[PDB]
Amino acid sequence: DPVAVARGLAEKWRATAVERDRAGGSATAEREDLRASGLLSLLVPREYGGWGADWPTAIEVVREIAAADGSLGHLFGYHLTNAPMIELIGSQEQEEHLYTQIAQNNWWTGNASSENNSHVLDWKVSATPTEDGGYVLNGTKHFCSGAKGSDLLFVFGVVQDDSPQQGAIIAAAIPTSRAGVTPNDDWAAIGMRQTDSGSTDFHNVKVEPDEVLGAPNAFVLAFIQSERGSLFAPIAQLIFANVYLGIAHGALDAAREYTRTQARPWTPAGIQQATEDPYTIRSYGEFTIALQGADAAAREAAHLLQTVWDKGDALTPEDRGELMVKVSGVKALATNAALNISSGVFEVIGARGTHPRYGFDRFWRNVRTHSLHDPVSYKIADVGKHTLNGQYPIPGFTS
Amino acid sequence: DPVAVARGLAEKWRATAVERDRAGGSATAEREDLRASGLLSLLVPREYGGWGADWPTAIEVVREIAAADGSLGHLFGYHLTNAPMIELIGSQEQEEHLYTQIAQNNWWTGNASSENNSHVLDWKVSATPTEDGGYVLNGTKHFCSGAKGSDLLFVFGVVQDDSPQQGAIIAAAIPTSRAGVTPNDDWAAIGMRQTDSGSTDFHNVKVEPDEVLGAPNAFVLAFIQSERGSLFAPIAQLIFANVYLGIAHGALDAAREYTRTQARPWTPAGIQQATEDPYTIRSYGEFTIALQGADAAAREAAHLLQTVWDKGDALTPEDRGELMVKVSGVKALATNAALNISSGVFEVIGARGTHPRYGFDRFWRNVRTHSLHDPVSYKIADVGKHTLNGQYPIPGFTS
Amino acid sequence: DPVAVARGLAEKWRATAVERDRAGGSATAEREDLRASGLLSLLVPREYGGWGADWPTAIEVVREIAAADGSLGHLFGYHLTNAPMIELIGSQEQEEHLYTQIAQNNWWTGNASSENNSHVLDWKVSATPTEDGGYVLNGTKHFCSGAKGSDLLFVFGVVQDDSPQQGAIIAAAIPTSRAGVTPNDDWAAIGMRQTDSGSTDFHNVKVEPDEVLGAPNAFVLAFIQSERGSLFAPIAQLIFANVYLGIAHGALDAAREYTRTQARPWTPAGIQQATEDPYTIRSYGEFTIALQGADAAAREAAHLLQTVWDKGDALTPEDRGELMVKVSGVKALATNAALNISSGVFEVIGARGTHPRYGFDRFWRNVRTHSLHDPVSYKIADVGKHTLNGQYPIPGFTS
Amino acid sequence: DPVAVARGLAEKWRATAVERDRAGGSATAEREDLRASGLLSLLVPREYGGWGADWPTAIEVVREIAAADGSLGHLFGYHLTNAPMIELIGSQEQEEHLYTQIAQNNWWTGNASSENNSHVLDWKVSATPTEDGGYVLNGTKHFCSGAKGSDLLFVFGVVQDDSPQQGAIIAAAIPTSRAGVTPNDDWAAIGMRQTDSGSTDFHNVKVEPDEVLGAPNAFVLAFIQSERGSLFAPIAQLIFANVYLGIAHGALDAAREYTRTQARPWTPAGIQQATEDPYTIRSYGEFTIALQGADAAAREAAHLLQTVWDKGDALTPEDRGELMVKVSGVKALATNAALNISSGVFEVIGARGTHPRYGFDRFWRNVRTHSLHDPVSYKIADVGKHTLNGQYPIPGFTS
């Protein structure tokens, strides 16, 4: 039972949660806890030595981790999205080989893939074709996800060459240890402090022909067609949404423990028990109700993702558009609820809860930081276009 | 397929929706459409001639109707809650007889039951015990639900007698046509104008021994014990929440049709197409998202209600308290979303939409009216008490 | 003291407020009450027989009236904007003559002026030049303000002629009684039911040379230049904002009276006094605070309007742009607070308040209807463009 | 011009704002900048060598400082409240002497006064009367305001003696340097990191008879009576509110600078200029409008404070209750706007703004921390009680 294991880890990590958030840097010990749990192979099919969990289950595990630790929930969650990329645009052979390696070695996968807000011809990583059919990568991917301690790195380069392949996005899974590859200890933010999201430098990094995933530009092709690879954004976006919800629960659970044990009643109002204050009770109702709505919608969306996933290549553009719209909604609901709860929970906690030893602002800092990955306003607009005009989002990395 | 039948009725009723809201009075024709549909016996088990539908399905049907017509959705929905009251506190024999009569005759059931905000000793309807073991009812039930056109009336009387039964609530299912029973044409409100929610007068109305449902005070007993009869409030409240969600969908669908065909763009802002205005698109996004969360939570709650229902007498006080807490949340989400959408939809409709021929305010008036049945603030407080203190609601008619 | 007179009228009108809202049609009696009060000449300078009140005072009067009656508040408020149009783009001679007539005769002024969302070449009222230097008007102004019972009609025609004046907006003040002028009894809406906002037909209506206000296209010229005439939108928009605030106070005052005298406490929660319910108290807190901020902003904007007004022709485009931005803010604050309060007030009133005899939904209906005159989204955008980019709104009828 | 001097200081401090927030500890340099400005004597009457500024001006100065630095705005603002305490309950002689010392020496005043949520008999600082007519203080004041670097310390002790003075609150102004007085370097919080809000220990600290302000329990007497000393809470609370508004402007100004120079447009939506994004523009509109209303309310309340203040001892319990109600509103408006804007600003800033070198979360951390000083829910409930029941807040330290 993967969820139970996550629960186990969450208990272990909670004793160091405040300190780790304060220290920042890499959460090396905890990453190792995860590796030892066997959880890294959660979505790898059983036949290759994985758990073969479904998306709903996998998302529950993400949520557990995110509640204990935003950074870890993001690290793990993003790790999960990587390997599916193989099933999505990679060959059958690449699929057997890579899934087997990840599962057998308990590999951390890492990401130096999309530049979500740059034209391909401006991407900072070039892929220059070699005559043996591979590529060499050069430049700095400024925003990465868990490249730093990874074993297998998923990288995108752009042929910026005046090749006939010019502007093609090249996807590859290469060892992080390969010469030329330098994941920097580069990451600094007010929140998500231990997500290892700094830059990686690529210096004449060779990509072997069999390390290349699908044809040149295979991702962009899959998007335009709404073929199976277009499931990328829906998957990443739903994981993110559920990280936020996990963080919201964590903040709410922390708050209530505190309210029960440490919070003092406002005596000038004649209140004798903090847990009996009518406004404190109302606030807890409102937090819970916001989560109840957002969680239920996230679960629907997870079953929908499963259904679409199980259709394999027979999925329609409508299937994927409907799923993306659903997920856009969840992303919005989760952003708004996690921000509101993470900040709001202070009101029922009181002045003493502002002490650094509680680290109570960490839940907000975590959500506030990652929720800026891609603008929630366009998630909302995409839902509105669909409701009003029947339009589907333009498939990309974030939609 | 009961939902497809409701859809068919909804199509019929939409042509008259504006006129009927404006006229008020009883929706006699439509009530007859419902009777002829067979839908009245929707929750009567198949073995008695009913559809034997589950709760989730019955709630979808309520939703379809509520989207076309809030009053009808409430009338039908409240009708559904009545017969289960037989299975809840009635005998097995009463069960077979009454279910069979309802299903065979396509009976409308009606309600002159609880006074939700009065002490039992102040209730306006007395039940005076007769020596044959029945009772006589006297007084006026000021707030009823669909007594007016009903065939079978569910009534509560209080022994206000200085009997040894004093203060006991007596529950009975009697024919509405019985002598002494006068459902008045009494109902006036700004919304829910066709719900027939006026008073009914009782004058030396005889209740036969086999028309009495369970022991004296059987309802109050079931509440204190959290036995099966305590399922009443969760069921009624979930139905209400779903009526609101239906209305919210009705308002939203009406708005979008209008925005697509009638609305004009704000030219001073350089907008050429109303469906391309970025704030109009955002607003539609928000309405959709608010509904997405609340609908998902209502669905969960419906499955939970099914699970608890299926436990029969084996249900724990915890089963029932958890259920009621879930339902309280739904009731809050639904109220808030229906109100916001119902009023907010005008912004994307424009000035011309205010013309009485569209009846666009009817959705808001409907929700605004029924949402006051019991205070949403205590639904919210009940959720907060559970989250913060682990307390369950005190079982009653509305909690 | 014009405010004390408004208070006096408000007392008189409150006895009939419910019935008049229900009846619709013209508020003939009440319009006469206003005429007899002498209040119609409120903004006419003392030297012409007027009260010569300043803008802050005049707005307080509008607010008093709007609290008693949304339709009348709008009727009166819009009347006030009309005559200033004379000082704005009319001659000194037209000024002395017309002001004197309005004040001596206690004239109602009415409006068949701007089509806010139509290109000038599509405006339904043509002004065809006559050789004596006047014009003839033809066509139907579909949306008017208080043309129906007016004495003096402010009308715009468009030379749609292939004149050399083609596309020029011609402003005239003519007697409503002139032959050809037919203000129809045409107005139907869910709210603002007695504002007489129907159409007026023009049939070869003669406008004499000295009835023409300013040169041809004088209004459009004043906007482009941000000259004194561009003060029109800021004035009208601030009047509207204050109508809404008036309505919001009317709802809130009505609610509180009801809560104090009629509302019953929620006994299941152990509440004994409705005025002692903590959530009821909180809600009144929030309504008050929302109004407190909106009102304070309204007053500031009114003093700013005075300051700019007093500058006469020396006003800068900056003066007028800053003013419009301030007013745009008030418009938004007022719309949002009036809608929220008008609907929210039902929560603290309870189910019985839904009875048509209280007409409690009239406040919301009135705000909900007029607030759609011009889109609040662009009032918000105009404030944002100013804050972010230093841009001023493009002068027009509504900005 | 005191505001211009504050502006000058604000410029100096902005270069170090990020680093200081990150470092925490005492803002020693900046405290000295303030001392050297002469601003500490801002509210000391001219006749004693002070600036004799009015409250509206003094509040503007607090606002300027708070925009640059939340901690400093709070430190300075709280300092301002202290000396008035002399004019409030102190003697005329104490007034001349103390005002003159503060102005001539440019003293920082500090506070170890009220325990806002403790019964007097549970207060941690005892005042034991001496036969020379003074007192000795013992115990730890756990929550102080700027006691650490102060020259003049305002202290409250409670006779916990079984004296005849038992339970009396003793107010004194003593030198912080006096033996027995130990302001600790004790303060740790997620925000307001440089307010020096730790504990001070008192150890057989002598208070001389002429260092005691007013009679024993003079503060509590002034509250019950609503005499001049009851102005304490309105003053403190209005200062707090304006500190929040200052911080809200600082966040908003910082955000707009960033949006204009650093922010990148969301290209997948076809946006080419960040400052032309319609949702970014709308967000700026909403932030501005929220402040526009709260600022306008704050200024009104400042003039009302001036008016009441100028009534000297002739102020009525109504005067003071109306004031406190107004101020409660502002406190609520300011809290809500500063929290919403401080967090919301990230959405228009984008992912890169999360870098610690911008310290963008400092505005939120500052508001989030101080806004918990006393519960905003009871500020809201006190407004609601006044609106609904005509009740005035019970005068105390926070109401």
Tally of CB atoms within 10 A around D19:
10
- State the Cα angle at C278 between C277 and C280, rounded to 5°: 65
Contact criterion met (CB below 8 Å) for D280 and D344 = no
Distance CA B260, CA B331 (A): 31
Contact criterion met (CB below 8 Å) for C365 and B361 = yes
Contact criterion met (CB below 8 Å) for D159 and D216 = yes
Distance CA A356, CA A342 (A): 16
- All residues of chain A having their beta carbon less than 8 Å from the beta carbon of residue B332 are 285, 289
Reference C335, options C306, C364, C304, C303; nearest CA is C364
Contact criterion met (CB below 8 Å) for A149 and A109 = no
Verify whether the Cβ–Cβ distance A283 to B384 is below 8 Å: yes
- Which residue bears the tokens 């044959």? B132
Characterise D277 by phi-psi region: left (phi > 0), alpha (psi -120 to 50), beta (else): beta
Chain C with chain D: Cβ pairs closer than 8 A: 121
Distance CA A278, CA A265 (A): 11
Verify whether the Cβ–Cβ distance D343 to A343 is below 8 Å: yes
The separation between CA B371 and the C-alpha centre of its own chain, rounded to angstroms, equals 11
C256 to chain A nearest CA, in Å? 21
Residue C18 burial (10 A CB sphere; 0-12, 13-18, 19+) = middle
- All residues of chain D having their beta carbon less than 8 Å from the beta carbon of residue C329 are 288-289, 292-293
What sign results for the dihedral spanned by CA atoms B146, B150, B156, B162? positive
Question: Exposure string (b/e) for C174-211, b if CB count within 10 Å is 16 or more?
Answer: bebeeeebebeebbebbbbbbbbbbbbbbeebbbeeeb
End-to-end CA distance of chain B: 32
Tally of CB atoms within 10 A around D396:
16
Distance CA B309, CA B54 (A): 10
Secondary structure class of A109 (helix, strand, coil): strand
CA distance readout (Å), A296 to A326, A347, B234, D313 = 12, 26, 19, 60
- All residues of chain B having their beta carbon less than 8 Å from the beta carbon of residue A283 are 384
Q: Which helix (H) or strand (E) holds D88?
A: helix D84-89
Nearest CA in chain A to C282: A279
Distance CA A251, CA A368 (A): 13
The DSSP code for B387 is H
Tally of CB atoms within 10 A around B223:
19
Contact criterion met (CB below 8 Å) for B125 and B204 = no
Chain A residue set in contact with B, beta carbons under 8 Å: 252, 256, 259-260, 275, 278, 280-289, 292-294, 296-297, 299-300, 326, 329-330, 332-333, 377, 380-389
The DSSP code for C399 is -
Reference A71, options A196, A233, A255, A183; nearest CA is A196
Contact criterion met (CB below 8 Å) for A396 and A327 = no
Q: Which amino acid is at A182?
A: T
Which domains are present in chain D? 1-108 (1.10.540.10), 109-216 (2.40.110.10), 217-399 (1.20.140.10)
Is residue A389 annotated as involved in ligand binding?
A: no
Tally of CB atoms within 10 A around B237:
24
Q: B145: which strand partners? A: B111
Verify whether the Cβ–Cβ distance B384 to A296 is below 8 Å: no
Please, which residues have CB within 8 angstroms of residue C12's CB and are 6 or more apart in sequence?
C33
Contact criterion met (CB below 8 Å) for A205 and A126 = no
D neighbours by CB contacts (3+ pairs under 8 Å): A, B, C
Q: Which DSSP string do the residues of B148-188 spell out, in sequence order? A: TT-SEEEEEEE--SSSTTTTPEEEEEEETTSTTEEE-S---
The token pair at C71 is 């339709």
Longest dimension (CA), chain C: 82
Verify whether the Cβ–Cβ distance C384 to D259 is below 8 Å: no
Nearest CA in chain D to A369: D354
Residue A218 burial (10 A CB sphere; 0-12, 13-18, 19+) = buried
Distance CA D108, CA C232 (A): 52
Alpha helices in chain B (DSSP H): 2-14, 17-23, 28-37, 55-68, 70-82, 84-89, 92-105, 218-225, 232-261, 278-310, 317-344, 346-349, 362-370, 376-389
Reference C346, options C282, C263, C268; nearest CA is C263
Distance CA C44, CA C54 (A): 10
Rg value, chain A, Cα = 22
Contact criterion met (CB below 8 Å) for A168 and A158 = yes
Distance CA C121, CA C169 (A): 10
Contact criterion met (CB below 8 Å) for A151 and A108 = yes
What does the CA dihedral C355, C356, C358, C362 come to, rounded to 10 degrees? 120
Q: Which amino acid is at A163?
A: S
Beta strands B109-112 and B152-158: pairing type?
Answer: parallel
Q: How many residues does chain D have?
A: 399
Helix/strand/coil percent split, chain D, to 5:
60, 10, 30
Please, which residues have CB within 8 angstroms of residue C26's CB and are 6 or more apart in sequence?
C148, C149, C185, C194, C196
The token pair at B70 is 């809030």
What does the CA dihedral A378, A383, A388, A390 come to, rounded to 10 degrees? 110
Contact criterion met (CB below 8 Å) for D209 and D132 = yes
Phi, psi dihedral angles at C156 (to 5 degrees): -115, 140
Q: Which DSSP string do the residues of D303-357 spell out, in sequence order? A: HHHHHHHTTGGG--HHHHHHHHHHHHHHHHHHHHHHHHHHHHTHHHH-GGGGSTT
Is residue B230 annotated as involved in ligand binding?
A: no
Contact criterion met (CB below 8 Å) for A211 and A192 = no
Distance CA D28, CA D72 (A): 11
Q: Which DSSP string do the residues of C139-171 spell out, in sequence order? A: EEESS-BS-TT-SEEEEEEE--SSSTTTTPEEE
Is residue C116 annotated as involved in ligand binding?
A: yes
End-to-end CA distance of chain A: 32
* Strand ranges, E, within chain C: 109-112, 126-129, 135-141, 152-158, 169-175, 181-183, 200-207
C278 to chain A nearest CA, in Å? 7
Distance CA C124, CA C120 (A): 9
Please, which residues have CB within 8 angstroms of residue A245's CB and are 6 or more apart in sequence?
A63, A66, A291, A294, A295, A298, A334, A337, A338
Verify whether the Cβ–Cβ distance C380 to D256 is below 8 Å: no
What does the CA dihedral D330, D333, D338, D343 come to, rounded to 10 degrees? 170
CA distance readout (Å), A156 to A110, A116, A175, C291 = 12, 12, 14, 55
Verify whether the Cβ–Cβ distance B289 to A329 is below 8 Å: yes
Tally of CB atoms within 10 A around B364:
30
- Which residue bears the tokens 């209040």? C39
